[PDB]
């Protein structure tokens, strides 16, 4: 099958249409880089390692590289985890990336170093050096990247990697980068824009600085840029979970009125978190194309009164308002201005943490004539009075927040080391409403979801509560105490897909009242069912029946209650659902699965799952019963012994699940004539050793995947044939040089089973 | 010392005074009653046992028992736990009870008796058989009570203990029983009152049945009755979390209106979950000295609203309306009634369960002029809008509860087997609270307490919030989010005395931003400090000061972080800290305590408490710079040795708790010249032996406790002295013939080191 044993621990992909030849050692602990890296070679990852320095014989055979990623491998001390610490720094060698002729890119992010190296090539494209002591920029060190066009300088002195120097870059640093479009000074401590920029900038990322005054003669050259943030400069410190600087006198970041006027091809403008209190119009007056405007964080709560800069974006796509409140004001209404009735391009409108008191019908009229206008985010206000009726104008919208507020009836860009496809969404979670009216729904039926989760519901439904939701095809009744007194709920839900009325378990908790499981027989099209984490104990109906039902989780549940011994009543809680499909019967504590419970399964089942369980010992004879199963999961269980001959236990079943399992030993015929298999899992088990009699290269040759690291293999001169079997077949084996050690005999500790060769087997 | 050793298994209290022997077996699990009980007993308890059955011989050499305690030996199927079954029901042979002349109380509750046991001695006076099987009363079988004064015959026939069969009591039952005084027949499925009861009726509780219908001639001769419970009849079922069995039609309990005629001396008249919906004052005609009256889970929010029969209880202390909301009905206000204004006496008035939307002033305008009016409940209301100054008229008042409502800026009697000291208090927990305003609590001086639990208030006090609160003593501030910024939080409350600030990990979880937590050195009378579960990391300020402090709970916190190694800022945290006298820095992660920081302790404390930390070695030397401690408190940690000597390690501790320790062995001088100790603990840990030498009687004579249970003792011949010890010192050891086991050798293991017996020692 396979003469060529390569002990590479790297996962290798080829794309002989890209000619890319990707090595990839994510996570993998190395101290030097392997030897014996093929030549066609073109992309090298190397994440968090223990790798000491490089050495120009690093890249010395390797000139087709155009990608590699050095990061982080000697954290800084409050960026990542402080369990893999380095002894000091990266230090490179002068003439180390030279050699690469055909580099393109350098990741070098989280590393500790103190200035940019010196020696790479010119045909570099990108460069990283985030997460660095580089606190100083001069033009000698820069002259080198006369072509490069990405260049990642950020997070190099702020609360989380402090240098305790302002940023200094000379005059004309960046001037001769011709090629330059990307920049990014995020969290440097950056005092003033280092001008002059490159004429060629399309995105500018100076956000999270220092940076107190900006001068008219700043973006004066820049006439490609299209993304220009500048959030955190002066920012809002108060109650913030981060340490911040403010600026004295709780002045806002002082931007001329002909700041933006060389701009005239910028889309995006993020002024986050600037304690702005002014937006002049005059600041719109050239940027024509503008799509993106972020202005959330700010002390705006008087502008959006005003804002009249909104009669200057008639091609605003986004626009962030949120968290604009004043200190100690509780408003008693919402005034949007006028104004807003001129973005006639807007689709997102997110004006969360505006809190005030009562949101009215009118409140909203400029918005009422948008016509691609779709998301309307209004959650963290605390509204306390708000008629969901007034909603009925918002109909070719597709997501209405109405998030935590109590209706009743810093760096996101951290690269560290549902209902929107239904149609009209109106999200109630986490609100204040405690019992639900047929007429607070009403003039609602075009909704075709809606959200209750977190409500709290105390209520026994009789089918009357959501009578206008005639369109309703999925209900989110999550975090809430259902009382299923009645068959009759949810029974006016005549398009009801999806129901979710998982986390109820305070009425189910209690034993004796009746628990009707069978009120999903008047739903016609229901085709999903989450009621997982309810603690189910005790149900007055036996059997539970649907037409159409083909999903159901029944998670978190008492299971081993309602099958326990001797009691033959809820065994065929499941025959009657005809169409389903995908059961999920997990972390329900049953020790033991009794015998018959499967005679009173769906017939058309194909996905179970039996994960976090507690089965002591599960049967495998009675999976014929089964003849549509094919994804049987058994993770996470306490299962002994695997079954005598798979083909004799089904003939469907190809997706066999046993992660975290305890098995000391398979079988000798396991995999005998069990051709239909493309699916194995025997991850963190106990398992000695694994013979051939039953792994057969025909039964081997088809399956796609296969997962037998963490356990406890002995790798002794026992199963030499597993040797020739690990290290000379192409089967689908991960983490299988790391993860998958040989715990024995004695010096044979923690070897790689595909690095084993065992010369004394056979002399 | 003493030469008479005492097997006996169970506790006894000697009063001769009262003539009172109480011999205490509680949760002992013996099989059968211990032989050699003293003949002077009086009072005998046996409660959850295994005991098999009660002969004859039991009872034989005691006379002057007057009380015996058989309850819940073998507890009904859901009464109690099942890791303890019998294997049958408990059986009395006849003439068990007839050689106690002097008996004058017995309870057999929980133990499964089928009918009332005959041969009970006329003196007896009471008589409980709850949570048991009998559910016939007939005249023959009590005959034999025409003495008894007490008779518990509840819990005999409901949900939890079913027996299928309506309770059947013949005619005049309990008619001859001229001296009986109190009668429960609470849950057991009464159908009618059993009539006629003896006129020298006192306490009726007839609550918890399925009585449907009341007759006039029921209490017609019950002129000495003074409380009558007929609560749960035709209950309200609604989101019931417990199997009730509602009246046909929804019709409340059947009361006519001559009912309650006969009753004159009825004090307590409880009608609660009677689903009534009208109260007609002819009920109130004739009991005149009614005190409390209880109406709650009913339909009475129509009542309420008129609450005609308030005009007939002039002397009413307490009057409960908890839960009368009707279904669907959201009301805009609460609608009392004046002739709540004719309630001279009244003192509590729980309203909970009112649910309405806003909360005004003039809504409680007849309870302005309720002199005795202390307590006003308003919980669990949901309301909205309550302005707080409205509350400037009910200064008179001590608790004005304010709970889980939104505002913004079965069986109680189950016999299984703060601020109100302060003065007026405002209870505003669990609300809709977000930030705290100075104008909100403005015209509410005068109170002594606030409770803000609950809230989540995301605010960064500076010293202006609680200004109006001028006579503040006690701030609840826990479960919130705190940001302690400045040092001039809290200043304005000068007469505060207790501060609890806990449950704000919020912000302390963060890194980087200022903890001042010096803010209690504006706190001139601040006594208790409440911080713990705070998860505190850093602090900005070095140390804590206060003139005043003497409690401070610092538990739950990141002590371990800021003591740690080489960090010698926070060693002196609590210097400052002059009349700090109790400390409770325990559960703070605290790994081992660095040498130095107890010179940083108070000089004044007396209470330090260091449980569930994990110290793994904490010195003992260092306790001499603690020259006032007394109860040292190092429970479930994981010390290992124990001092050398405790003379030369304090003078003054003498409340040593090592509960739940890892120690082996003690050594041979630890309370050598430790005469001031007085108390010591060290239960649940694994010593082996403990001789002589170190436990002389000069010390052991004077300590008032001492326990030394669940350990793993080895009763060898090693220690023959513990055995003379342990067997003939009178020196208190709690659980010492149960708990305190044997683990050895061979056939001495799981015996009782109080019945030791080592006769091939010393042959
Ligand atoms: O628990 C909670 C957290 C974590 C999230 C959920 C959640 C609410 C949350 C929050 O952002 N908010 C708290 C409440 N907010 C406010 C705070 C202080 C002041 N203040 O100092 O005057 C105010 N004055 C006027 C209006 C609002 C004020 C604004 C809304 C966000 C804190
Ligand atoms: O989570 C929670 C729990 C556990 C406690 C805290 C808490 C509130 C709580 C509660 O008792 N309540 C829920 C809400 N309550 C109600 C429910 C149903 C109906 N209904 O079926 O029409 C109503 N119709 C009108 C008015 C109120 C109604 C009454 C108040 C009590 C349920």
Same mark, same amino acid.
């Given at each position: ?23 990839? !050692? ?30 120009? #014989? ?98 190099? !002195?702020?609360?989380? =990697?402090? !240098?305790?120097?302002?940023?200094? /870059? ?25 001008? +002059? ?11 999270? =600085?220092?940076?107190?005054? /900006? ?16 959030? $955190? ?14 600026? *004295? ?7 001329? %009125?002909?700041?933006?006027? #060389? ?27 503008? @799509? ?8 705006? #709560? ?32 919402? =005034? ?26 009118? @409140? ?39 998030? %935590? ?13 549902? !209902? ?33 989760? $977190? ?11 959501? @009578?206008?939701? #005639? ?53 016609? +099209? ?16 036996? &059997? ?27 065994? @065929? ?32 089942? *194909? ?23 094919? &994804? ?90 597993? +040797? ?18 040989? %715990? $024995? ?7 790689? %089973? ?10």
């Amino acid at each position: 099958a396979r003469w060529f044993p390569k002990t590479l621990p790297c996962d290798v992909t080829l794309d002989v249409s890209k000619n890319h030849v990707i090595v990839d !050692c994510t996570d993998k602990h190395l101290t030097e880089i392997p030897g014996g890296i093929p030549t066609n070679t073109t992309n090298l990852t190397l994440t968090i390692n223990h790798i000491p320095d490089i050495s120009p #014989a690093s890249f010395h055979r390797l000139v087709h590289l155009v990608e590699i990623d050095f990061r982080c491998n000697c954290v800084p001390i409050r960026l990542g985890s402080k369990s893999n610490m380095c002894p000091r720094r990266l230090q490179i060698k002068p003439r180390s990336f030279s050699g690469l002729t055909y580099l393109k890119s350098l990741y070098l992010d989280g590393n500790q170093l103190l200035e940019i190296p010196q020696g790479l090539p010119p045909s570099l494209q990108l460069l990283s050096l985030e997460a660095n002591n580089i606190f100083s920029i001069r033009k000698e060190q820069l002259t080198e990247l006369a072509n490069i066009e990405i260049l990642y300088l950020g997070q190099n !002195c702020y609360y989380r =990697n402090p !240098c305790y120097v302002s940023y200094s /870059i000379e005059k004309d640093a960046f001037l001769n980068l011709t090629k330059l479009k990307v920049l990014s000074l995020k969290d440097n401590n950056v005092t003033t824009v280092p001008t +002059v920029l490159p004429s060629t900038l399309t995105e500018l990322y100076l956000y999270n =600085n220092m940076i107190a005054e /900006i001068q008219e003669d700043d973006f004066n050259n820049l006439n490609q840029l299209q993304i220009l943030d500048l959030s $955190g400069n002066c920012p809002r410190c108060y109650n913030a979970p981060f340490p911040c600087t403010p600026c *004295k006198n709780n002045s806002p970041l002082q931007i001329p %009125v002909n700041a933006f006027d #060389a701009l005239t091809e910028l889309k995006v403008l993020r002024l986050h978190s600037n304690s702005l209190q002014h937006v002049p119009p005059r600041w719109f007056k050239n940027i024509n194309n503008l @799509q993106e405007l972020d202005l959330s964080q700010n002390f705006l #709560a008087k502008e959006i009164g005003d804002a009249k800069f909104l009669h200057f974006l008639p091609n605003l796509i986004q626009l962030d308002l949120s968290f604009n409140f004043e200190l100690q004001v509780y408003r008693a209404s919402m =005034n949007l201005s006028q104004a807003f009735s001129s973005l006639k391009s807007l689709k997102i409108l997110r004006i969360r943490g505006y809190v005030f008191k009562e949101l009215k019908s009118f @409140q909203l009229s400029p918005l009422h004539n948008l016509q691609n206008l779709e998301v309307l985010d209004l959650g963290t206000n605390f509204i306390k009075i708000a008629n969901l009726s007034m909603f009925k104008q918002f109909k070719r919208l597709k997501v209405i927040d109405l998030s %935590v507020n109590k209706i009743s009836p810093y760096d996101k860009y951290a690269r560290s080391c549902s !209902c929107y496809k239904y149609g009209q969404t109106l999200d109630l979670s986490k609100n204040s409403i405690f019992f639900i009216k047929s007429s607070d729904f009403q003039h609602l039926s075009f909704l075709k979801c809606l959200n209750l989760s $977190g409500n709290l519901i105390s209520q026994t439904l009789n089918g009357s509560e959501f @009578q206008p939701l #005639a369109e309703l095809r999925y209900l989110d009744f999550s975090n809430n105490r259902l009382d299923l007194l009645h068959s009759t709920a949810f029974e006016e839900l005549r398009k009801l897909e999806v129901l979710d009325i998982s986390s109820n378990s305070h009425y189910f908790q209690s034993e004796g009242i009746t628990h009707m499981l069978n009120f999903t027989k008047n739903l016609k +099209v229901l085709q999903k069912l989450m009621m997982n984490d309810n603690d189910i104990s005790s149900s007055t109906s036996r &059997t539970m029946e649907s037409e159409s039902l083909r999903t159901l989780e029944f998670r978190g549940n008492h299971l081993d209650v309602l099958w326990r011994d001797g009691d033959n009543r809820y065994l @065929q809680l499941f025959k009657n659902l005809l169409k389903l499909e995908e059961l999920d019967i997990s972390k329900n504590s049953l020790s033991f699965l009794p015998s018959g419970v499967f005679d009173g399964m769906p017939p058309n089942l *194909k996905n179970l799952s039996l994960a976090k369980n507690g089965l002591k010992s599960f049967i495998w004879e009675k999976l014929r019963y089964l003849k549509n199963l094919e &994804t049987l999961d058994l993770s996470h269980n306490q299962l002994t012994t695997v079954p005598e001959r798979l083909s004799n236990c089904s003939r469907s079943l190809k997706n066999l699940i046993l992660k975290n399992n305890q098995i000391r030993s398979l079988t000798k015929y396991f995999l005998q004539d069990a051709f239909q298999l493309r699916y194995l899992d025997l991850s963190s088990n106990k398992i000695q050793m694994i013979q051939k009699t039953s792994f057969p290269e025909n039964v081997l040759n088809n399956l796609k995947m296969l997962l037998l690291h963490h356990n406890r293999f002995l790798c002794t001169c026992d199963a030499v044939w597993f +040797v020739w079997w690990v290290q000379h077949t192409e089967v689908t084996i991960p983490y299988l040089a790391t993860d998958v050690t040989c %715990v $024995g005999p004695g010096a044979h500790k923690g070897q790689s %089973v595909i690095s084993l060769d065992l010369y004394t087997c056979e002399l």
